From a paper:
Among the sweet-tasting proteins, thaumatin is ~100,000 times sweeter than sucrose on a molar basis and about 1,600 times sweeter on a weight basis. The intensely sweet taste of thaumatin has been widely used not only as a natural sweetener, but also as a flavor enhancer and for masking unpleasant tastes in the food and pharmaceutical industries. Site-directed mutagenesis studies revealed that six lysine residues of Lys19, Lys49, Lys67, Lys106, Lys163, and Lys187, and three arginine residues of Arg76, Arg79, and Arg82 located on the cleft-containing side are responsible for sweetness, and two amino acids residues, Lys67 and Arg82, are particularly important for sweetness. In the present study, three mutant X-ray crystallographic structures of thaumatin (K78A, K106A, and K137A) were determined at resolutions of 1.07, 1.07 and 1.01 Å, respectively.
The threshold values of sweetness of K49A, K106A, and K163A were 140, 140, and 180 nM, respectively, which is about a 3.1- to 4-fold reduction of sweetness. The structure consists of 3,267 protein atoms including hydrogen atoms, 20 tartrate atoms, 18 glycerol atoms and 300 water molecules. The normalized B-factor ratio of Ala106 was 0.68 for main-chain and 0.72 for side-chain and those of Lys106 in recombinant thaumatin for main-chain and side-chain were 0.61 and 1.25, respectively. The normalized B-factor ratio decreased by 0.53 for side-chain, suggesting that the flexibility of side-chain was also reduced. Besides, the flexibility of Lys106 is substantially lower than that of Lys78 and Lys137 in wild type structure, suggesting that the lower flexibility of side-chain at interaction sites might not help support good complementarity with sweet receptor. The detailed structural assignment at an atomic level revealed no significant conformational changes in interaction sites of Ala106 as well as Arg82 were induced by mutation. With K106A thaumatin, the volume of positive charge from lysine residue was reduced but the distribution of charge was relatively small when compared to K78A and K137A. Compared to Lys78 and Lys137, Lys106 is not relatively exposed to the molecular surface. As to Lys106, it was 5.0 Å from CG of Asp173_T1R2, which also interacted with Arg82 in the length of 4.6 Å. Since the interaction to Asp173_T1R2 still is retained, substantial reduction of sweetness might not be induced by K106A.
Numbering used by the authors: 1 to 207
Write the structure that this text describes.
């Protein structure tokens, strides 16, 4: 499957793509404002994620740091990123269909549209100004809006027991972005797409 990753933000981002135990494609790349990077994701990828990273530095070997979304200091991510990270999430070719969502469960850093480029389903978007409106206790000094699990490490926010409800913090994310997951047990906003669809992830879609 092809994913075109487009940075419409006025700032550089470092895109990242991983399924947690491996890179997807090269796993990461710099995207200056306006740049597009097309990746190939193997059919059948389950639990893949794409995100943006901000305020990164890398040496000539591809090691460094990012202020949001840092994946073990690598340019070319093999693991998931450090919150806060707005997440484009997908599982492809799962019994004949693809499943896509946006999640704020690991916080928010950059606004996002995640849409098919092929027929048969709709996209999802989280493009509100969550960083600007972020509750004071959730603001990440390194940049972004943390989720409450990251900040407070409770069973209720992290949904550790499989039993949790919405919270004042989840409700903030949900109010700004109804179409994205706000906590683990949120009413799902997953879209079912034809199997083997192709996609576009746009950072700062309303930029």
């Amino acid at each position: 499957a092809t994913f075109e990753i487009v940075n419409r933000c006025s700032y550089t981002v470092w895109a990242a793509a991983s399924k947690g135990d491996a890179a997807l494609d090269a796993g990461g790349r710099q995207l200056n404002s306006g740049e597009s990077w097309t990746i190939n994701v193997e059919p059948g990828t389950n639990g893949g994620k794409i995100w943006a990273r901000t305020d990164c530095y890398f040496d000539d070997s591809g090691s460094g740091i990012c202020k949001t979304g840092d994946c073990g200091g690598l340019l070319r991510c093999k693991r998931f990123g450090r919150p806060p990270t707005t997440l484009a999430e997908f599982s492809l070719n799962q019994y004949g269909k693809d499943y896509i969502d946006i999640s704020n469960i690991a916080g928010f850093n950059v606004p996002m549209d995640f849409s098919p480029t092929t027929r048969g389903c709709r996209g999802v978007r989280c493009a509100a100004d969550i960083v600007g409106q972020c509750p004071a206790k959730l603001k990440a000094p390194g940049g972004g809006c943390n989720d409450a699990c990251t900040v407070f490490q409770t069973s209720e926010y992290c949904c550790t027991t499989g039993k949790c409800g919405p919270t004042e913090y989840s409700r903030f994310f949900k109010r700004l972005c109804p179409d994205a997951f706000s906590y683990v047990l949120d009413k799902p906003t997953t879209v079912t797409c034809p199997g083997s669809s192709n996609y576009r992830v746009t950072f700062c879609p309303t930029a």
